[PDB]
Amino acid sequence: CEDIIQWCRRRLPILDWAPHYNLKENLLPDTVSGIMLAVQQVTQGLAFAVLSSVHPVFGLYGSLFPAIIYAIFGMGHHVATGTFALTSLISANAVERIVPQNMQSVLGLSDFEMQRIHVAAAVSFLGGVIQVAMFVLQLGSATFVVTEPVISAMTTGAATHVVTSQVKYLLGMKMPYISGPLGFFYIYAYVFENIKSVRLEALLLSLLSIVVLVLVKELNEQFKRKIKVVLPVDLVLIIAASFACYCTNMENTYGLEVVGHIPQGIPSPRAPPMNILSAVITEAFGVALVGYVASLALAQGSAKKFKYSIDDNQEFLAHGLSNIVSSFFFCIPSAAAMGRTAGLYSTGAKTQVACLISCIFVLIVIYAIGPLLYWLPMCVLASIIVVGLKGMLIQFRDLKKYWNVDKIDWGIWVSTYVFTICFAANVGLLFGVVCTIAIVIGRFPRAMTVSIKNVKIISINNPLVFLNAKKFYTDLMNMICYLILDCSGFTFFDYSGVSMLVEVYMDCKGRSVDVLLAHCTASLIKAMTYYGNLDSEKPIFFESVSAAISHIHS
Template identity: 55%
Template sequence: MHRSKRQRWFSSTWERLSNIGLSDVALWFRRRLPILEWAPKYNVRESLLPDTVSGLMLTVQQVTQGLAFAVMSSVHPVFGLYGSFFPPLIYAVFGMGRHLVTGTFAITSLISASAVERLVPPYSGNVSNSSLGPLGLSDYEMQRIGVAASVTFLGGIIQICLFVCNLGCATFLLSEPVVSSMTTGAATHVVTSQVKYLLGLKMPYISGPLGMFNIYIYILKNITNATVAAVIISIICLVVLVLVKELNQRYKSRIRMEIPIDLILIILTSLVCYFVNMEQGYDLEVVGHLPQGIPVPQAPPMDILSDILVEGFSVALVGYTVSIFLVYNSAKKFKYSVDENQELLANGLTNVIPSFLFCIPNAGAPARSFVLFSNGAKSQVACLISCVLILLVIYVIGPFLYWLPMSALACIIVVALKGMLIQFNDLKKYWNVDKVDWAIWICTYVFTICFAANIGLLFGVLFSIALGMLRLSRAKTLHLVHWDAEYNKMLEDLNSGFFQNVKIVSVGMPLLFLNVKKFHADMLKMNNKLTGNIVPKKKTDLLLSPVSNGDSNGEPPTLQPQPQRSESYTLILDCSGITFYDYTGVTILTQMCLELKGQGTTVLLTGCSDSLVRALQYCGLESKNQTFLDSVNSALSSLHLQTSRTSNFEAIDSTSV
């Protein structure tokens, strides 16, 4: 019996394999290698110039932040250059984000540093100082990058395993307030890690619970040991960077290319440090010698993987979370689709492959992705151009960065984190839309700064799910609407034509980040029905009948063939069932209403609570032409007064458990 089952399985498997054709293979390659999809369509005339300008601007950020994040990861700065070169190349082939910049990232660097400092403590003279190959780095430095590369490898393997398990769709568990607060808290940690360079202080590595506060306590106790030259350079660099970047942003429409203040600052501070000999004369810490060229690939140490499980999972989850939200923003702005599972594969490969090339953990970088946004980049070609220039730095320009002060490098990092730090402004919109989201943001931020980014992310997800489940369990998801005398009078005109293009949809569910994807999918299915086939009319004592009550990924209900009608119709959306909502839900509802109006559909919202009306208006839905009405009855009466035509009436109810 078991043998016959095995035979049937082998025969069915062989039959499926034998039926695979060239078209199936080509489709698979296009899905797994997105570059095959967009590269043949690349418009050189329209896209090459903005991509080239964006690539030039991006190179400066990649080099400076690569050096700084390598130091933050407790390894030699040159490994940050490798981490800025290899991951973007791989992501350009496998990734779907057209404006995502992958490379060294502050949060993953901090996570990696905890493993490096734990397994390879600071140099004490007992470690062999012999050089290794053409890099000319000590065994101590190679041991440290070995640990960081192992964290990179393990994080990538975990992401690929999640891809194999098709868990990319689990991003629905990540609400916007959780990601916003986690990244803001992580940015606070990064700024804290740079304070010692801003002040020129020599201090031990401090980590663990409340480690950020212990760092500031140590700094306050030893503030008299600060290097005066480092403090002066930091103040000047911070003022210049902030002023010039603000001018670039304010006069963006008047200038063709932003002032590359980061590059200018690197050149000027390096020249000043060289001619004044500030390293020896003023005890100023500089980047130091950067080996030229790329080393021969080498497998990271595998015997320590069990010791870095926590860091590996943290890199995998935190890195992917930040990357996928950057891709979401890019896809939303430039209107293209994204496969979350493919992004898992792309992120996994950008960690696994570079781990054999001495790279620290990497992820999508918000500040550098914004560089592509602001300079009008069109595709990943901008990142590829940047990689070519970084290769030039690795082989030619690297030695000239010897005199770059660490304090200037720290200033560039702190100012680059502005976009993440100003997410404190999100608190205002969460308070105005949903105070529970506001509380989630505050609690997640507190956990992040008290512990670490991975702990904050885990707490935020669990906390938001717990609150969401509690709110959903107390919500009334279904309600019954009975006929009354006025409805009966109107329905006597069913065959007269007045109600032919009037459709009613009842939303009988709360709108939260947990169910907005399903709500969006059901609304799209409903709209396809209303712009396609007419639902057969049935006699009933209810005004509303369900559109979808199953999984959003399921098949839509089977419809009987009916005559086609015009795509333009009037939609009455009964929102009396929306007993509560959050910012994500209100945003999706607003987006759907605006999209339908853009297609020529008149949308009337009925039964909205006062707080929901205020939230919708705050998110951009204007109350023109009586968009908000008290009830379905009021909407029908209003429509009846606006036209003298009579038509058939069809009632549709979209409810969700």
């Protein structure tokens, strides 16, 4: 009765912070964070919808719709759901495979543009369905398999992949869709083979914009104590570039790529094309895994920093519901990006309200100044993206820590980074997880099982399992008229451990060495008595080492 109501209330985390909303504190920083996040989301959506080989207008919908669903069903406070180019790079494979370039209407867009957004929407819907399906299980309670070095290496490799996917806009050249197990080097080979087609105007503009952005963003952070605000350099740069492009004929005099139409939209929702759900299984799995792990890392970091507890299983439901609901409005797969979380940290956001004022501003942009973004050069947008990827790219400094701490996760980090830079992000994540599991499995047979205490007393550590049964037998045999075994920490065992213990007892009896147990539990006592046919009228199992010592003096 009441338990069901409590469960239902626990599945709606918006009821825990909405009635407790402070108006004196969390209204001005929330609004400022909302405006900054709105600008960030607009830019990132426009830049990452193109990265997925999809018309840029759908990036606004992908940055607007899932945010509300996450706000309703999400537990993280400083998590802003958006486009997350990592998933765009995965969806682009399916989009370009199902509908390639050779075959070149609800919003006035020409055909061959619907056939790509339909594939993207199907991918997002399947990813959301998968996320909800592993939410209804207890998946999420087992998320310790993914480790900090693995996520760091995968994110750094994906950031490098995104950086190398924007050079075709900074230089101004045109490239075909190159992807595969070694596309990172093929892209540079193509760039260097056609080095005579690089436009100087686009390169100079990109260099100037990058220098200005880096200088402003560094000087603002260095002297944050004197100016207690965040300078909106991106908006000023965008406005200046657009006005310079419009006031001149820079579209025609110099060959430059600009954002095409961005029509006023939000059309009627339509169901995804369920008939192609069988051709996008791998993309859906990759999206549903990488987006979830990347968002969960940020949510856990926020929870640790701001001293609150989250649930690793509610994020599954939140992300799955957001993807499923947003798939009906022609949206690409969605997740949480590190840049928006860093911006929220810097501005000083407090609650999830800042993710709704940004939605309001995105709606205003969609319905009011949609056609006003025609004169924005693509070089400026690419420079903004590569500057914003600084937080992801700076993670190379963790190598010193991993080298000075363990020297084993250093190798895992290097291997995961290499595999991510070669094949892809999802392959790198899978390789890192498998390598971590194999390494932790292979270390058990090479560790000492028993310890010697100052008639000898020998203490067992704990997990006497099939991983370290033969090693335990070897360690105990290499250590020999009496012998006491302290099984205090020993609580975790299986058939192999019991068999090895009984064999040890039998062999020690053969060598005329008596073995007495000290702190055996009830289940272990029952199992050892059954397996070895031990009589209950002979003192073997005791309750403490002192009791065994007292029994010795007889």
